[PDB]
Design a protein around this nucleic acid. Structure first.
Lengths: 387, 57, 133
RNA sequence: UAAUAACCGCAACAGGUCUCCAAGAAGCAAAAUCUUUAGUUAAAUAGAAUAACGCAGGUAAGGGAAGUCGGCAACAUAGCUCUGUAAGUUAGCAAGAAAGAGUAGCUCUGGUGAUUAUCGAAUCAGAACUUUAAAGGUUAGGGG
RNA sequence: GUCAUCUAAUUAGUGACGCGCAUGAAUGGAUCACCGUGAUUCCCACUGUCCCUAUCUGCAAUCUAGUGAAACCACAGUCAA
RNA sequence: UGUCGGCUCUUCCUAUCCAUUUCAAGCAGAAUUGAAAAAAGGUAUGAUUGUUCACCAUUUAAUAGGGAACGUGAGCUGGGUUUAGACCGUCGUGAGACAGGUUAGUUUUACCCUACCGUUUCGGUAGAUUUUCAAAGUAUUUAGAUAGUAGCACAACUCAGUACGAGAGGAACCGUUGUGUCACGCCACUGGAUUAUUCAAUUAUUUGAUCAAAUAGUGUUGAGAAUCUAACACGUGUUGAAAUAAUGGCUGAAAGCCUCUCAAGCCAGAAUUUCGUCUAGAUGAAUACUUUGUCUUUUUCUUGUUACUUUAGUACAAUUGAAAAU
RNA sequence: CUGUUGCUUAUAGACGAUGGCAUCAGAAAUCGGUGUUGUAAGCUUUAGAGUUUCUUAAUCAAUACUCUCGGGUAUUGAAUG
């Protein structure tokens, strides 16, 4: 027969099967379409999420009914210390997709990049990139490098730089660096390589990749929830109280005669450590140089972005950071792969200037009141301690 | 804004506002202060209040 | 009869949710029946927020108003709702004023405050309000 | 032995099986809850992790039966004192009808007796002052 | 059934009409005050019954050491026509 | 073969109710009416009845019709039907009968194979020799045959009291701004749970009293951080190109004229299809380090792999294989 | 080179898996920062309504100010040294 009353199906079929990922970092599966009539530029970065905080933003839009005072909005603080470029790789378009032709590597490789090639460093002889470094200047092994460059300029269409983070500047306990291939989009392949070769061993900062008021496509791996039922995972209706053998489940898992459970039926499984790529994430503040603090024109108290007591479970943010708009996929300390948007937005919101009237730096535990610990002591006065 | 019961200075975007039927509205800072206000508790007898600390010392 | 774009207000009134009557039309309580402009869903009861025209039946009041279906507008509700400028406010009790489809208010006075969301939506209500919270 | 191991149940079965003796606190109560003399710490095995779906016990914003065959289940009223208590009626009842007020702590005062001032009993009433404004830990009517 | 009433809405309830397929007088007819772990309807209070599900505890479930059965079983076990 | 209905959930058909694109009207506007492409999306809340059905009160853009053993009972419920108690009405002399009525009436097992959702462990892809090379092992960065697919809809301002029309009445394209729901998240702000038996208070019993606790399987109450979470907070899915379907057309024969073509060649046109983007993904690629430089088989060491060890045996550089297009 | 094992391991988790570190490891306290509750225990303010007395003082006395923005707790899935 026909279902008595029609309803929207629960859950999404574009994500089935729901297989949890293995590597914590989420590989970006596509880069913005190459434009051949501009100066070569990096199209991505890699930052570690720290937490969230709320801001009061002045509205700079036209023909809107939002209050002139401000709009309270949530932001996300993604700490991005500068990365180090450690080579580049040239791809070629064949009848079976891209095919990595060669890969040129720099001379001096940090110990945070060598660790990625081993599974037990404390017992490993740590001889990675040793023969490559020791014979770097030899004439035989210098012509090979010059040969690789001429191969890429002739038989390649895509050039990417193998950039890795620096793990000594983040409060994470991890030591090995996270490696990302950031494509270069710009002029012809002759000048892409000349740009890629110019970047070797040279740190790249986020302001050289992104710009102010730029929307980005963050790609990351969501929170881990483990085995979960049908009510949490898909969202089906919980059965009445009278039910025998329990309530929180799907009742009918298929009609009789197909004689098989469909792939579309809501089933128990593992919701959790998935990979999701959101789009159109507006950047509010670019914490580079002058804007590395949390002060504004309206509120001129000199305070760092770290709330009183530090970001929970994370620590203290002291290096370059972003201010994404809203919630990005993944809990604190996750490795977030930012990316320049593949489909740039033309809405009047995406073209709006971001003017911030206030950024909350009060503590994130309990119902905290003060903003800086140098103003809690002034309002509360002298305690019995220290007196 | 200033909390009705506790007398503390409310931050921005924090607290809940209660509007009575007699056109008077109050803004609080937490549910701890709102709950004690709905039970007619006198802030002049509650020690941690900013109102109590202003009265003495 | 509404004049403008309502924002998002967390609806706290359901079907068969008695509200008071801030009007002076000799009606006391109006139990909500439906909500005008409610895009429904399976097994979902109609929800009324602040500034939402409803359809309510009078179960207590004067005889010419009792046992009939009217059209009302919610002026204050007890469910906390957040304004766009980061204000979190709630009232003391639910209430609603009897209007018609054109928005012409049937009564002539309103007792107690009126929420801002339900004042700019219907300009015929803001004039009668003592205050607009 | 006279039983959550000696009896009858296929057994060291949460079932069944007639009696005598009986401490304190608290209350109207051999009620619920805690302890003294007495008995026992073993009575179809335990450790780790703290997923789903469960059995048992709970709580919740705003609305309050719109859920459903049906207020099923759950929630709510609950002790005592005072005031008050309808229709109907076999004149007995309905009636704890419905409804409303009080209840704590500390310091005091008075009333209720025996022997010719002393001595003994928990019981009722009243007055100040203080607080977190008081039967509600347990027991404990939903009403029309 | 029809007509009033109950509700916004009543195959339900109550009160009336009675050519009653097929009621009717110890196969008892009418009448109920009290009483009932009896049957039915509507109000007040109350609430996760529901909007709409969230979360907490014990025992399990999962893994492990020791011990360790039963129902069932032609041969067995991917689909379309 | 557990025989009605309902709750829950998935999918399929189009004989389409709404949204998209088009023709016709006795289409001036608004409303409506007939038909064509099209099944990717959506199709409600309640009173009475066990009801499917029905009839009413609302709401929405619409509240369309159907199948899957009259989908779905080791998924549930047991309202009816459909055993055993009892009552009434008619029939029967009597036991008793009644698709007539009323009330009360036990819903068993999955630990098996497969299916589906998740999760591991071992194996693995055959033609490469510019030593600046080639192959195997370990690891990282990538690649993407295939499978899925995601965004829809409404409302308000302007257009505009304009076009139309005598008047009554009365739209639309671009643009701006919000809402609802679906999907993916997320913990700052707001709300909820809370055995941090956290801090405080307090009822009964016991430590001679104070302090400090304990017991009532968590005594109870108030506040309550962390974490979890919101249908209760808040963000993203306004995102581009090409080709199409019904239809409207261009040049144009057949058939000196006419015709969009049951002709050759083209253009515009859908919520459509395909790239783009999102998720899972097999054979692969590059680089780093260890080796190997023709070769495998059997025993054997390791948690396991490669290199490695012994006795053997086997060939030793030199004539092959490309026009494209019609 | 990989695996086991260890940190009663986390950004993961039913078990495997996955992620980090493995002597510059790791853990434990302590001191700060940040939170939750509401002024700790000892004695004093004839505070204190009254009773009792020596016989014209002390005793007992709910509550209550001073020391007290005090004490207690604070990663257990919080952040420094």
């Amino acid at each position: 027969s026909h279902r008595k009353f029609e309803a929207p199906r629960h859950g999404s079929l574009a994500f089935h099967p729901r297989k949890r990922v293995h590597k914590v970092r989420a590989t970006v599966s596509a880069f913005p379409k190459d434009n051949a009539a501009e100066k070569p530029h990096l199209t991505g970065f890699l930052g570690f999420k720290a937490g969230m905080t709320h801001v009061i933003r002045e509205v700079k839009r036209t023909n809107t009914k939002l209050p002139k005072d401000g709009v309270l909005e949530p932001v996300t603080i993604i700490e991005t210390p500068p990365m180090v470029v450690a080579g580049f790789v040239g791809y070629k378009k064949t009848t079976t997709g891209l095919k990595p032709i060669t890969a040129v590597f720099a001379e001096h490789i940090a110990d945070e990049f060598k660790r990625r090639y081993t599974k037990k460093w404390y017992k490993n002889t740590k001889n990675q990139f040793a023969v490559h470094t020791e014979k770097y200047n030899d004439v035989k092994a210098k012509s090979k490098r010059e040969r690789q460059i001429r191969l890429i300029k002739n038989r390649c269409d895509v050039v990417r730089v193998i950039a890795h983070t620096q793990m000594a500047l983040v409060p994470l306990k991890q030591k090995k660096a996270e490696v990302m291939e950031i494509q270069i989009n710009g002029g012809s392949i002759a000048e892409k390589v000349d740009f890629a070769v110019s970047l070797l061993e040279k740190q790249i900062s986020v302001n050289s990749v992104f710009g102010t008021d730029e929307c980005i496509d963050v790609c990351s791996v969501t929170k881990g929830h483990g085995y979960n039922g049908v009510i949490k995972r898909f969202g089906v209706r919980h059965l009445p109280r009278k039910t025998h053998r329990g309530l929180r489940k799907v009742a009918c898992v298929g009609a009789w005669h197909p004689a098989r459970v469909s792939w579309t039926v809501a089933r128990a499984g593992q919701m959790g450590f998935f990979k999701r790529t959101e789009v159109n994430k507006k950047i509010y503040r670019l914490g580079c140089g002058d804007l590395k603090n949390a002060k504004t024109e309206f509120d001129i108290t000199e305070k760092g972005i770290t709330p009183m007591g530090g970001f929970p479970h994370y620590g203290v943010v002291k290096n370059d950071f972003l201010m994404i708009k809203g919630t990005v996929a993944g809990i604190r300390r996750r490795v977030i792969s930012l990316r320049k948007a593949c489909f740039p937005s033309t809405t009047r919101t995406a073209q709006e200037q971001i003017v911030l009237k206030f950024i909350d730096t009060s503590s994130k535990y309990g119902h905290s009141r003060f903003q800086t610990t140098t103003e809690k002591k002034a309002r509360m006065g002298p305690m019995k301690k220290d007196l | 804004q200033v909390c009705a019961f506790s007398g503390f200075k409310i931050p921005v975007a924090k607290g809940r506002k209660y509007v009575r039927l007699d056109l008077k509205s109050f803004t609080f800072i937490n549910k701890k202060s709102l709950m004690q206000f709905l039970r007619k508790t006198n802030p002049r007898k509650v020690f941690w209040t900013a109102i109590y600390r202003q009265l003495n010392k | 009869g509404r004049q403008g774009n309502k924002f998002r207000v967390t609806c706290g009134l359901n079907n068969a949710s008695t509200v008071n009557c801030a009007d002076n039309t000799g009606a006391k309580t109006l139990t909500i029946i439906s909500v005008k402009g409610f895009h429904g869903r399976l097994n979902r009861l109609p929800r009324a927020g602040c500034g939402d025209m409803v359809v309510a039946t009078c179960k207590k009041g004067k005889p010419e108003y009792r046992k009939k279906m009217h059209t009302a507008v919610i002026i204050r509700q007890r469910r906390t709702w957040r304004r766009k400028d980061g204000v979190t406010l709630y009232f003391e009790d639910n209430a609603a004023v009897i209007v018609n489809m054109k928005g012409e208010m049937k009564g002539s006075a309103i007792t107690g405050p009126v929420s801002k969301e339900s004042a700019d939506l219907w300009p015929k209500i803001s004039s009668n309000a003592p205050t607009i919270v």
